[PDB]
Design a protein around this nucleic acid. Structure first.
Length: 201
RNA sequence: UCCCCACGCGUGUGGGGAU
C-alpha cells in the first residue's frame, strides 16, 4: 500500500479569543496545530501542513495520527480526521489547490526572496510540480492553472510573506515522487500555512 | 528584499523556522 496521511477539517469558532488569535497570526496557528502531533514532531516522523481556506475552515494534513483533544474547548468544530492512502498512477489527472510562497535564493546574496511576477510564479509552480513527479495539464490558451489570490501573510515571531493561491489541473508523472511531494509539501512557509498541495479527481 | 541547515545543481537548488 501507500503510507498513511491524515486530513482534518477544523471549523474555527469566531467567538473564541484563541481561535481569532490563531486566525490573525499564522505563527500562533502553527503553535496550536503542532500540539496535535507533538511527539511525532519530536521524533522526526511528522510534516505538519495546513491551509486556511478562503465560519473559517482550516485543513490540516499530518503524516501521523493527530490527537485533537489538545485543542481548547470552544476553539473549533473538529470533523473526524480521515486517514487516506493516495493511490497515484502514471497519467492520472487530478485537480489541485496550493497556497504557496514562490521564491528563489539569490546567488549574489544567499537570501531567499519572493518571486515578483505572475509569469515567474506560474513558472515556479510548473518547475516544482515537474521536479516533484507531477505536470500541469495544458490547453490551447496556456497551462491549466489560475492564481485565485495573491496577498501577504502578516507574521509576527513583523514579516510579510507572499502567499499565492494556485488552482488547476495536473497529471501524475512519477507516482513515487508524486507521493513524496504530497507528503512533504511544496515550497517555503510550511510553518505558516503555505505549501499544502491538495489533489483530488 | 527576516533567521538557520546542507552543497564542488550558484543569471542557485533543496530543507527547517511549536512545546
Amino acid at each position: 500500500g501507500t503510507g498513511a496521511m491524515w486530513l482534518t477539517k477544523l471549523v474555527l469558532n469566531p467567538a473564541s479569543r484563541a481561535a481569532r488569535r490563531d486566525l490573525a497570526n499564522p505563527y500562533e496557528m502553527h503553535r496550536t496545530l503542532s500540539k496535535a502531533v507533538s511527539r511525532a514532531l519530536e521524533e522526526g516522523r511528522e510534516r505538519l501542513l495546513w491551509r486556511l481556506e478562503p465560519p473559517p475552515v482550516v485543513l490540516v494534513q499530518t503524516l501521523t495520527e493527530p490527537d485533537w483533544s489538545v485543542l481548547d474547548e470552544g476553539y473549533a468544530q473538529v470533523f473526524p480526521p480521515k486517514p487516506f492512502h493516495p493511490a497515484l498512477k502514471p497519467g492520472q489527472r487530478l485537480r489541485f489547490r496550493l497556497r504557496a510562497n514562490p521564491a528563489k535564493r539569490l546567488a549574489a546574496t544567499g537570501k531567499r526572496v519572493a518571486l515578483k511576477t505572475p509569469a515567474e510564479k506560474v513558472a515556479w509552480l510548473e518547475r516544482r510540480l515537474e521536479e516533484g513527479g507531477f505536470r500541469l495539464l495544458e490547453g490551447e490558451r496556456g497551462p491549466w492553472v489560475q492564481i485565485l489570490q495573491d496577498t501577504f501573510l502578516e507574521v509576527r515571531r513583523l514579516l510579510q510573506v507572499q502567499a499565492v493561491l494556485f488552482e488547476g489541473r495536473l497529471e501524475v508523472v512519477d507516482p513515487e515522487r508524486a507521493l513524496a511531494t504530497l507528503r512533504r509539501g511544496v515550497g517555503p512557509g510550511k510553518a505558516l500555512g503555505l505549501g499544502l498541495l491538495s489533489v483530488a479527481p
